[PDB]
Amino acid sequence: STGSATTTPIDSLDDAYITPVQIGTPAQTLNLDFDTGSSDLWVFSSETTASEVDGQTIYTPSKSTTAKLLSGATWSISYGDGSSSSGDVYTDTVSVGGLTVTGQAVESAKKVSSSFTEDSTIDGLLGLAFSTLNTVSPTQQKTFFDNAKASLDSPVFTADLGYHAPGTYNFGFIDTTAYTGSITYTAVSTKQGFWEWTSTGYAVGSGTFKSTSIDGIADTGTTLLYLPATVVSAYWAQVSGAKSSSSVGGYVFPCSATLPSFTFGVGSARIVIPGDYIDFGPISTGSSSCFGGIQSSAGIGINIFGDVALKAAFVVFNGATTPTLGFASK
């Protein structure tokens, strides 16, 4: 079996992408953020503290004939940005673009931090990292991908994110019309529970490619590209007036400047991120200082190939016994 769903940016800056997901019987459609950097499927629900809900569509397990409370199970998660959520667990039927999983753990949020409450367009997260990161206690739960794996024609899912435009998440097949050239596959380490891989280098604009190993994670749930200070300083030194600002919390650049492209290596292949993808617009409305899409990973401890990098490629997440990541130009 296969599944195919359209994912749409939530705003004009591609801050996040939402994909409709059907939960329960009869279906309740919620717009979830597909996150390859986490492994919990959690939703805003009828149990979420009324003051922490601001416009989201909520899941109501009492209206679903297939919902079952997973007795005693609780969850609690904290994200890299400091945001957090917790609550209880239900099992229910979950379908993504025609692909159905029965008995999927659906983590009902009882409490959510301000960051989630503010984002009225996001009803929850659908985690696609390895099930070893799932926070359900005392019995760890599987991700939607892990549960669907046996039913899939191929144990893969693909991410084809758009630049200021909708894209697609496909499960169980590779659309040979969505990319150009060939797909370069690279080894994945599942040791930390992430889609962790090694980039073979980088180039800034039309500069020469520097071969150097950069370990990092393929993370659809992170907006920006976070790389070592050395790489980020080499990029921003090519933009007139660019600087790191403590007030803002990152590199900013004059909105009038033209940004060079950024190339990252995948084995012997090169992925080119156009300069336009690195522009995140004014730091405040009317400001002449614009926020950069390439930031330092020094304060995080892990390099992250977020949406800025991923949207420049057709990306294959191969969940076979020996996992791999595939990248192709598009």
**Could you tell me if 88 and 182 lie in one domain?**
no
**Could you tell me if 12 and 67 lie in one domain?**
yes
**Could you tell me if 121 and 68 lie in one domain?**
yes
Contacts of residue 194, defined as CB under 8 A and 6 or more positions apart, other chains included, come to 36, 37, 129, 130, 133, 217, 219
CB 220 within 8 A of CB 37: yes
Closest CA to 76 of 113, 129, 30: 113
Of 14, 33, 35, 307, catalytic? 35
**How many CB atoms neighbour CB 40 within 10 A?**
25
Instruction: List beta partners, residue 218.
Output: 305
Instruction: List beta partners, residue 43.
Output: 108, 124
Of 45, 95, 108, 199, catalytic? 199
Question: And the tokens for 48?
Answer: 């979420």
Helix or strand run (H / E) with residue 308? helix 307-310
Domain membership of residue 163 as a residue range: 5-174
**Could you tell me if 181 and 287 lie in one domain?**
yes
Inter-CA distances, 303 with 4, 18, 52, 294, Å: 29, 24, 32, 11
Instruction: List beta partners, residue 18.
Output: 8, 33
Domain boundary among 113, 140, 174: 174
Tokens 């019995």 -> residue = 139
Distance CA 108, CA 233 (A): 42
Q: Report DSSP state, residue 291.
A: E
Distance CA 175, CA 169 (A): 11
**Could you tell me if 202 and 83 lie in one domain?**
no
**Could you tell me if 170 and 185 lie in one domain?**
no
What's the distance, CA 278 to chain centroid?
Answer: 17
Inter-CA distances, 204 with 59, 170, 236, Å: 45, 32, 9
Q: Three-state DSSP class for 116?
A: helix
Tokens 């930390």 -> residue = 192
**Could you tell me if 10 and 130 lie in one domain?**
yes
Domain boundary among 174, 209, 231: 174
Cα angle for residues 201, 311, 12 (degrees, 5° grid) = 130
Contacts of residue 154, defined as CB under 8 A and 6 or more positions apart, other chains included, come to 172, 173, 174
CB 226 within 8 A of CB 303: yes
Q: Report DSSP state, residue 25.
A: T
DSSP string, 228-253: -HHHHHHHHTTSTT-EEETTTTEEEE
160 has catalytic annotation = no
Q: Three-state DSSP class for 185?
A: strand
**Could you tell me if 190 and 128 lie in one domain?**
no
35 has catalytic annotation = yes
Cα dihedral 62, 63, 68, 69 sign: negative
Domains in the chain, number: 2
Q: How was this structure determined?
A: X-ray
DSSP string, 85-112: EEEEEEEEEEEETTEEEEEEEEEEEEEE
**Could you tell me if 81 and 91 lie in one domain?**
yes
**Could you tell me if 118 and 16 lie in one domain?**
yes
**Could you tell me if 139 and 179 lie in one domain?**
no
* CA end-to-end distance (rounded Å), the chain: 25
Domain boundary among 174, 194, 217: 174
**Could you tell me if 196 and 165 lie in one domain?**
no
Supply φ then ψ for residue 305, to 5 degrees. -90, 90
